[PDB]
Amino acid sequence: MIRNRLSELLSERGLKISRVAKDVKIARSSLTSMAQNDSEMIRYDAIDKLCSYLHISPSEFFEHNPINFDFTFDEEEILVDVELDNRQKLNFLDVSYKETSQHRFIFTIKNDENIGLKKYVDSLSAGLKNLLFKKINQKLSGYVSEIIVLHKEILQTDSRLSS
Amino acid sequence: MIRNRLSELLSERGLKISRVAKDVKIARSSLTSMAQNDSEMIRYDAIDKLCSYLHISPSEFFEHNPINFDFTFDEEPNYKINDVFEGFANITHAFSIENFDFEILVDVELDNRQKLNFDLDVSYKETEKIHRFIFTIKNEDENIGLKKYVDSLSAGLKNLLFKKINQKLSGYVSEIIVKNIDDIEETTLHKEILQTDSRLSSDIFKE
Amino acid sequence: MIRNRLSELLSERGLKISRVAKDVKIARSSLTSMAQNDSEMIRYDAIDKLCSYLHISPSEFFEHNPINFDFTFDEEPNYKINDVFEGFEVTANITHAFSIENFDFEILVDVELDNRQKLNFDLDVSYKETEKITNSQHRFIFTIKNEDENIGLKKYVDSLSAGLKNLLFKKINQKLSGYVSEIIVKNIDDIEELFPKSTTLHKEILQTDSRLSSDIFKE
Amino acid sequence: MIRNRLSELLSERGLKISRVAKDVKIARSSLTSMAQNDSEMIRYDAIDKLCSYLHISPSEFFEHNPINFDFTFDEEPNYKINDVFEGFEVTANITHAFSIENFDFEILVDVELDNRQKLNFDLDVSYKETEKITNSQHRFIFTIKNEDENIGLKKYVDSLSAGLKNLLFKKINQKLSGYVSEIIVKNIDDIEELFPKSTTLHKEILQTDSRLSSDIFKE
Amino acid sequence: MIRNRLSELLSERGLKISRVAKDVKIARSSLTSMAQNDSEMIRYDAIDKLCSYLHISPSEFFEHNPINFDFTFDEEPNYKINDVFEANITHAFSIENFDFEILVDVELDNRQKLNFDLDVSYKETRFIFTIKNEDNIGLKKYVDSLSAGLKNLLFKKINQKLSGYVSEIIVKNIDIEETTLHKEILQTDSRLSSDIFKE
Amino acid sequence: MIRNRLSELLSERGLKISRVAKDVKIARSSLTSMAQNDSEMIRYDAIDKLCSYLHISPSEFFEHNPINFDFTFVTANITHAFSENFEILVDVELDNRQKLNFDLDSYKETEKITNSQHRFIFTIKNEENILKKYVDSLSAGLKNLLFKKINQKLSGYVSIIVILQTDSRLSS
Amino acid sequence: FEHNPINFDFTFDEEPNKINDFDFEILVNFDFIFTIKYSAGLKNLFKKINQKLS
Amino acid sequence: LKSRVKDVKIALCSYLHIPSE
């Protein structure tokens, strides 16, 4: 669980993406992608150029939490595996379709044994939780569209969870 | 100036590339390079995995100093190459250089926007055999300000800077040399020139 | 900023363009271009002849202010274009061919002083209305949407003289004209008139020019 | 006469051509051409950048003198050329290909002062010998015949400064070399060597440059 | 400014082009053309025969004055022509406004050269033009100095050149055949009427 | 008999043909031809520009005399090419209409000062010493012009032979 | 056979060295005849390592 | 324990503490 903090810092200091790109000589698209926790790799040069410009040590740019989450699906259930440190691996479910520019199916988990999992999710900070929420949805949405298969409308459609 | 400070941590811990490779499912080949500070891009999954396995925080997996050094090489160098047919593996048998002088422009940007500027001049000295071309700066008294800035850095950053500048110097010399030398069939002469490297020795960059 | 004070000198001394063009042996077209500041490169011989004929040292021929403004426009703007079918073919009129709903983009200005320090101001521009200068030509009129936070730019601009401010005002408008026209031409294709010397919509929209009225930038 | 004083300023301030080119974002070739006076047309942006970077007004960037010299070469000279045979092919030594017996031409100099009145001085030049200063490149030497009846021209030239005098000398020699090389190449055809990178006689003679050495036109 | 004085001499003597053409054996057309000061070249042979026949010195034959007038016409004129679709030139084309600048460069006996500038505007219809600024009085003071004959020659030169600039512009801008319109305008002339060049 | 005194004026004032041509904007060849009394027709513009430049009235430019004269008729070496042995009817029409008539009648010898120029000396047989008094009164320039004209015309007639470069001399 | 409450994980290096016309790292958490607490029936796992080297 | 019994690393005796059955 790791995330950038560029989005916030930029909001706090009042600077807009446009100036940041011109001053640090980095393409707008890459800088925009790096601020939403989308890119998978962060070029070292980018970290040094930004840290120098925003006058911040790399302590602020990166936010880390040792707790990790593992998700597993079959080819036929969201098998989350809270994996805290000390190799204290744990296991936690069943979700079923409930109801249906933005088409969104609201699948809903329906199961008094999630009390430990809910406590674990509550501990994560706002940004990491938002990353976790985006990650769980992205994974399921990728898998769900496979069942439906010109314009590939299903690809644009995503899934949703609630609990 | 940013480095990854992986090797240091691993040594004090007492582990080895081999163990970590499996303990955290990271290709042995990649985990090797990322330890020599010589990989352009680092992924996030690596950061979290390594930070957790060694119970550390990102703050100590990175070292950052505001000063940045940029190196622009000369476009018109004064060089004489004397094709020697006798002898050709030796390199000295294939070609020797009477002279080779070019100008290095170094720009040092401090924390404050202030952009101090320094100028350097380099000259061919001799050919040692570890072969390795050796180049030495001419003026180190009119340009001592650069030396003060280089020493203010830590050991790792200085080592990285030295690795970078030496590689860049090797690039200009090897590329310029390959253009005015006739290739001879054997590991051809051109291939031997490419593998060759050059080192700059001075008080300003002692290590 | 630098300019050729040829026009002011010619106006003051009372000479006309033809008399000078014939006497110093420089071609009229080139001389009348150098009267304005459209020309990019000037020849040494022209400077020598014009300085000798008018009894002036090169100090009075050039006026230089150390300040230097830079202009860069937003790469990804917001534009809304509605196709209008009101019989453009019969009469070549801008309003008939199309209408503009909303046009928003960012203009970043980077005032650089004589000192090595560099300031930074931002400007937001919006479309207001199209106007009729001649019954054959029109000029779109935009307006800056933030003047309470950019009083500095007004303070620095007013430090210039009349000619250099005229030169700057021409530069910003000319750059705005090309950028706005390029977006419209890329978005909408061309239509030719029914009765032809025939002029298409692309050429007509390329010839037209924009303007950026604002309390800060005038004259 | 007018010249750009970039070289003297760069020498005085201690800066070097490489540093200036990187700082003002101008290609080194153009800047080193502008260091001399070979360039004919210069850009406004170059003037602004170089004046801003060096903290100088344009009054110091240009030096101007109202005087103006115009040289018109004769259209009918007397050329005496012998096609000496000495195996030029073995070694490209110009003197082997040919020798000059007697080359005489008339140079008409008009000196236009700041006042509308103008004077007129006439000069006669003759061939003498070949300097052979460099084994690869030889320079022809010509001397002004009448110096006693043209003393007035010397008085006027000495009123100019060092740089403008240098510029004047560069012009008379460059034009004299073009007039001579053109005449010589018109008289004799070309011969090429078998063993090269091969250079013909035409190309070698065009490369060869002359020089007019006399007290009036010193330095 | 140089003119031949043959026409004045023949009238005072009492002869006529017809008589001389036979006495000096010179073609009648050539002799009568050389009599109107409008031939570009005079042959050496002609001077000796005529000088001997009239018992006159060459100095009497030629009249010379140092002042030289050079006229340069504008290259960008304000021409506005109203086309009429109903030969009489007044029916083909009618001129609204035709304004251009004439630059005059009087060269005195001394090397010093004075400069005067004149503006010319269309008045009515021989397309008669007139000069806007007559005060530019320095040019007039000099025209008066020229003798009676030389002044007439200068007036003829300006009138012919004016026709050149005008006719060309009009014919090169307006289209017709019924001696067509084009063959009429080129023949049409023009005259600059004002006190400065009064004849 | 009419000639222009440009050459004498240029020699007297010290000016050279090169400078005069540039100042008066007249081609060098035309001015050179005019300065040696060769061209047949001349322009008014040249007369005015030259007179103003030299500050001279046309009186000095032209020299005229009413007396007129009328005439009526193995190797590349010219001498070896051909190989044994005409009368000239001259008049002296005076200004008073007192026309007079003179008769002069063969090849005497050939003299070539140089290989480049061959001259045939057609000395006159002296068939009227009164003609000679008339030629004497003339000035130097007009007499030289008369010599040049008669030599040119008679040489042209003799080059009968058809070689062209060679010129015939009628001397006495 | 005998239920074993212990299983072993062995992994050699992927880059061994020596030839003429051999030191490697075995991963088990602990770390020509090549030399260097957990019934003798099963112990005879030893058999698997034998085939591993050759 | 069902897909859930992954921990076996197979697309038991020491895993569920059961030759036994």
Numbering used by the authors:
A (entry chain C): 1 to 76, 106 to 121, 123 to 130, 136 to 146, 148 to 185, 205 to 218
B (entry chain D): 1 to 88, 92 to 133, 138 to 193, 203 to 223
C (entry chain E), D (entry chain F): 1 to 196, 201 to 223
E (entry chain G): 1 to 86, 92 to 130, 139 to 148, 150 to 189, 191 to 193, 203 to 223
F (entry chain H): 1 to 73, 90 to 99, 101 to 102, 105 to 124, 126 to 147, 149 to 151, 153 to 181, 183 to 185, ...
G (entry chain B): 62 to 78, 80 to 83, 103 to 109, 120 to 122, 140 to 144, 155 to 156, 161 to 166, 168 to 177
H (entry chain A): 15 to 16, 18 to 20, 22 to 27, 50 to 56, 58 to 60
Question: What does the article say, verbatim?
Answer:
Investigating Stl2’s oligomeric state by mass photometry showed two peaks, one corresponding to the dimeric form (54 kDa) and a second peak of 626 kDa, indicating that Stl2 displayed distinct oligomeric states in solution. To further analyze the oligomeric state of Stl2 in solution we solved the apo Stl2 structure by cryo-EM. We generated a cryo-EM map of the undecamer state with C11 symmetry and discovered that the circles were composed by 11, 12, and 13 dimers of Stl2. We extracted particles with a smaller box size so that three complete Stl2 dimers were resolved imposing D1 symmetry at an overall 3.7 Å resolution. Notably, at the interfaces of monomer-monomer and dimer-dimer contacts, the local resolution improved to 2.5 Å. The structure of the dimer displays a peculiar butterfly shape, where the N-terminal domain (NTD) and the C-terminal domain (CTD) are the body and the wings of the butterfly respectively. The dimer-dimer interface corresponds to a patch of the antiparallel β-sheet present in the CTD and the α-helix 2 present in the NTD. We first analyzed these two mutants by mass photometry and confirmed that they displayed only one peak corresponding to the dimeric state, indicating that they had lost their ability to form circles/filaments of dimers.
To parasitize a phage, the SaPIs employ a transcriptional repressor, Stl, which in addition to repressing the SaPI genes, senses an active phage infection by binding to the phage-encoded anti-repressor protein. Here, we show that the phage satellite SaPI2, which does not encode orthodox anti-phage defense systems, provides antiviral immunity mediated by Stl2, the SaPI2-encoded transcriptional repressor. Stl2 targets and inhibits phage-encoded HRs, including Sak and Sak4, two HRs from the Rad52-like and Rad51-like superfamilies. Here we have focused on two recombinases, an annealase called Sak, and a recombinase called Sak4, belonging to the Rad52-like and Rad51-like superfamilies respectively.
